[PDB]
Design a protein around this ligand. Structure first.
Ligand SMILES: [Ca+2]
Ligand SMILES: [Ca+2]
Ligand SMILES: [Ca+2]
Length: 627
């Protein structure tokens, strides 16, 4: 009894001291927490990165004191003083748990619905890695993914997407305990809804009866072919009434001793280490790849591999759409990165995200390609879970417009400092007839405003490969790779220019003579800028052309490099088939921009580019206007 009550009142006491947060949810889930963590959860406080630990996700991240209490009591590096600093500036206990900051936190939750989607990704990674690595009974990948979620989570559409897909893929090691704390706007029959996803459902569990919860979890674990949801019905004075009379933050040694998990955790990891040694004796190359990939490290020869492939891409000098350049880059990277896991939100023939060796993940088998269905938000938040798990490097594609359907998952990846790769195709009015509901205008500009996010808009096959390789190399941030539907002309480059692509912007065509201005262009508009430079030169007006595949990356280059690309006092003109307003950061009040700030139109692409002023004459006149 007191083992649940200590969680209950540690939470209430820390919330009270902070005078911020909600104490009811952690208090209602204390028996659920006690049951899962003392009877089932396999974890080692001495090594929060133990490869085969069970993964726990508190999807209703507002109940954060529940998780902080559990980490403290079981012996993680989180102290009473840390709990006394709940929600205080720079404390180890922010109001929502933060991955990478606090040992034992598996994901950053707060925005509702995404936690269960993260967990689906973690369970998917376990399934994928188990199919790939486990061999003749040596099951080095074998752990569960447990989730606590609440009513807010279940109302959100992203929970529908993630749990629907989890049902189709038969994720039997995903086990959800739902805090059903209800007796107007929420009347769903949750057991019936989750039956319709193909889940195993344990309804009507007494959420304060540890015997009932343990039996339900046992039933969930036995259902190996379906994810499970367990519907847990939950409900100073209350303190001594519930039998907890210790003052705030006082915990007796006997209760710390009963809760401590270091002895059991150590024996767990030692037992796994013995299994991995048997595995390493029989499968040493696989064993070494498992460690590399779980450690989230790239192959030692990655850069030399990419450099060789880039030289070959240049030898081909293909004029293709960069969505095809993307598929070519994926092929190149996949040879080198066995951890690569692709997918698309029902746009595989459009995003061009499969490669020659992609194997679709199914209910019965592993693979390296996920058909997410028409579920962009689910895809983004599932990819966050895939990358948090370790062992795989996911990418997932949709049309650039539908970045808006998964927008907060993109932001949460950046906040968590993780490195999923978000792929987007059909990036401008250049997509043509599908019209203004699909034609991006402002999306690329808005994506650039996400802190700790790299946005790449490569102009040809060479920039596309560099963008992919840089996205794959980045250790602590995500990337958006933005690709065109229409063919883009390959640009010739020196060896130095090729090597400067990774600096985000570079001079792709210097002026013949002293530059009178600089044209900054990205993606599909570089060719237009180069053509305008030639027309201007024929009029005796010398300008330089700068390709800026990533503003994000250019902005963190040293000042000398940025000045070498964009010299002070040289008028700047930006050309991009999107909203103009972000370019004033570069061109200022006396520069200019060739862009589009209104909605698109349903028509062939060539006509739209002409109608909206993406023409040589307009770029030339605009350049002249700032001289
Ligand atoms: Ca909730
Ligand atoms: Ca409720
Ligand atoms: Ca119209």
């Amino acid at each position: 009894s007191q083992l649940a009550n200590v969680i209950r009142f540690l939470s209430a006491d820390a919330v009270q001291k902070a005078n911020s947060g909600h104490p009811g949810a952690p208090m209602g889930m204390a028996e659920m927490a006690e049951t899962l963590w003392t009877k089932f959860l396999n974890h080692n406080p001495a090594n929060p990165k133990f490869y085969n630990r069970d993964r726990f996700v508190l999807s209703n991240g507002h109940a954060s004191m529940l998780l902080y209490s559990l980490l403290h009591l079981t012996g993680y590096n989180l102290s009473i003083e840390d709990l006394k600093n709940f929600r205080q500036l720079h404390s180890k206990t922010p109001g929502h748990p933060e991955y990478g900051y606090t040992d034992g936190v598996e994901t950053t939750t707060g925005p509702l619905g995404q936690g269960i989607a993260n967990a689906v990704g973690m369970a998917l990674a376990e399934k994928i890695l188990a199919a790939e690595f486990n061999k003749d009974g040596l099951n080095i990948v074998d752990h569960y993914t447990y989730v606590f979620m609440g009513d807010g989570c279940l109302m959100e559409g992203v929970s529908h997407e993630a749990c629907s897909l989890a049902g189709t893929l038969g994720l039997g090691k995903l086990i959800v305990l739902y805090d059903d704390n209800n007796i107007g706007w929420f009347t769903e029959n949750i057991p019936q809804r989750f039956e319709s996803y193909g889940w195993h459902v344990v309804p009507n569990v007494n959420g304060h009866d540890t015997a009932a919860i343990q039996t339900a979890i046992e039933a969930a674990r036995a259902e190996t072919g379906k994810p499970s949801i367990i519907c847990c019905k939950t409900l100073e004075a209350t303190r001594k009434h519930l039998g907890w009379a210790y003052p705030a933050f006082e915990i007796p040694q006997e209760i710390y001793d009963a809760w401590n998990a270091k002895e059991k955790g150590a024996k767990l990891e030692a037992g796994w280490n013995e299994l991995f040694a048997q595995y390493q004796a029989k499968y040493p190359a696989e064993a070494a790849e498992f460690v590399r990939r779980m450690d989230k490290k790239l192959p030692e020869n990655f850069d030399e591999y990419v450099q060789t492939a880039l030289k070959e891409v240049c030898a081909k000098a293909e004029t293709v759409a960069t969505r095809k350049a993307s598929q070519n880059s994926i092929e190149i990277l996949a040879k080198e990165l066995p951890e690569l896991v692709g997918g698309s939100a029902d746009l595989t023939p459009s995003n061009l995200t499969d490669w020659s060796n992609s194997v679709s993940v199914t209910r019965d088998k592993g693979g390296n390609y996920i058909h997410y269905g028409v579920r962009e938000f689910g895809m983004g938040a599932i990819m966050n879970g895939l990358v948090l798990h370790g062992g795989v490097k996911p990418f997932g594609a949709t049309f650039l417009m539908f970045s808006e359907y998964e927008r907060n998952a993109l932001r949460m990846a950046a906040l968590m400092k993780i490195n999923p790769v978000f792929v987007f195709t059909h990036d401008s009015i250049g997509l043509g007839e599908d019209g203004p509901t699909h034609q991006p205008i402002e999306q690329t500009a808005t994506l650039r405003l996400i802190p700790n996010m790299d946005v790449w808009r490569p102009c040809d096959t060479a920039e596309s490969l560099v963008a992919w390789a840089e996205a794959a190399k980045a250790e602590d941030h995500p990337s958006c790779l933005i690709f065109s539907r229409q063919n883009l002309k390959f640009q010739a480059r020196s060896e130095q220019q090729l090597n400067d692509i990774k600096r985000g912007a570079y001079v792709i065509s210097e002026a013949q003579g002293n530059a009178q201005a600089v044209i900054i262009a990205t993606g599909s508009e570089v060719g237009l800028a180069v053509e305008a430079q030639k027309v201007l030169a024929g009029q005796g007006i010398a300008v330089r052309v700068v390709s800026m595949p990533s503003t994000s990356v250019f902005d963190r280059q040293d000042a000398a490099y940025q000045a070498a690309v964009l010299p002070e006092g040289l008028p700047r003109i930006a050309v991009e088939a999107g909203h103009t307003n972000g370019w004033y950061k570069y061109v200022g009040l006396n520069g200019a921009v060739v862009g589009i700030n209104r909605f698109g139109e349903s028509a062939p692409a060539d006509l739209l580019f002409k109608a909206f002023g993406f023409t040589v004459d307009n770029v030339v006149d605009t350049v002249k206007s700032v001289l």
